[PDB]
Amino acid sequence: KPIEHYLDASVITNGLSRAFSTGAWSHPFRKMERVSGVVANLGRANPLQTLIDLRRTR
RNA sequence: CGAGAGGUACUUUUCUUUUCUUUCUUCUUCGG
């Protein structure tokens, strides 16, 4: 059996896409209870909103 | 059809005369 059969390559991509879509990021001092409010959508009404959206600290 | 996000939305809402004192150092009252 080759080495490219047991290593699932999609289990990282399907986890990262779900974490980027749902916003539920991993807790720094836990395993379950994923926090919400890490990623956000950009506003495209004026270039000032997307400038202050890249300049936030929560 | 349910969840997650951001947004509109409580604005002053109770301060009282605004004329308040600095021209000061001024007889204690009764009877022996």
UniProtKB/Swiss-Prot annotation:
Subcellular location: Nucleus
Free-text tissue specificity from the UniProt record: Mostly expressed in seedlings, flowers and roots, present ubiquitously, except in sperm cells.
Signal peptide: none
Transmembrane segments annotated in the record for this chain: none
Domain of life: Eukaryota
Consequence of gene disruption: Blocked in the perpetuation of CNN, CG and CNG methylation in repeated endogenous DNA. Reduction of heterochromatin association and methylation into chromocenters, coincident with decondensation and losses in cytosine methylation at pericentromeric major repeats such as 5S gene clusters and AtSN1 retroelements during interphase, independently of siRNA accumulation. Altered cell-to-cell movement of siRNA beyond the vasculature. Reduced 35S promoter homology-dependent transcriptional gene silencing (TGS) in transgenic plants.
Similarity annotation: Belongs to the RNA polymerase beta chain family.
Subunit: Component of the RNA polymerase IV and V complexes. Interacts with SSH1, NRPD1 and NRPE1.
Function: DNA-dependent RNA polymerase catalyzes the transcription of DNA into RNA using the four ribonucleoside triphosphates as substrates. Second largest component of RNA polymerases IV and V which mediate short-interfering RNAs (siRNA) accumulation and subsequent RNA-directed DNA methylation-dependent (RdDM) transcriptional gene silencing (TGS) of endogenous repeated sequences, including transposable elements. Proposed to contribute to the polymerase catalytic activity and forms the polymerase active center together with the largest subunit.
Record-given protein name: DNA-directed RNA polymerases IV and V subunit 2
Section covered of the full-length record: 437 to 494 of 1172
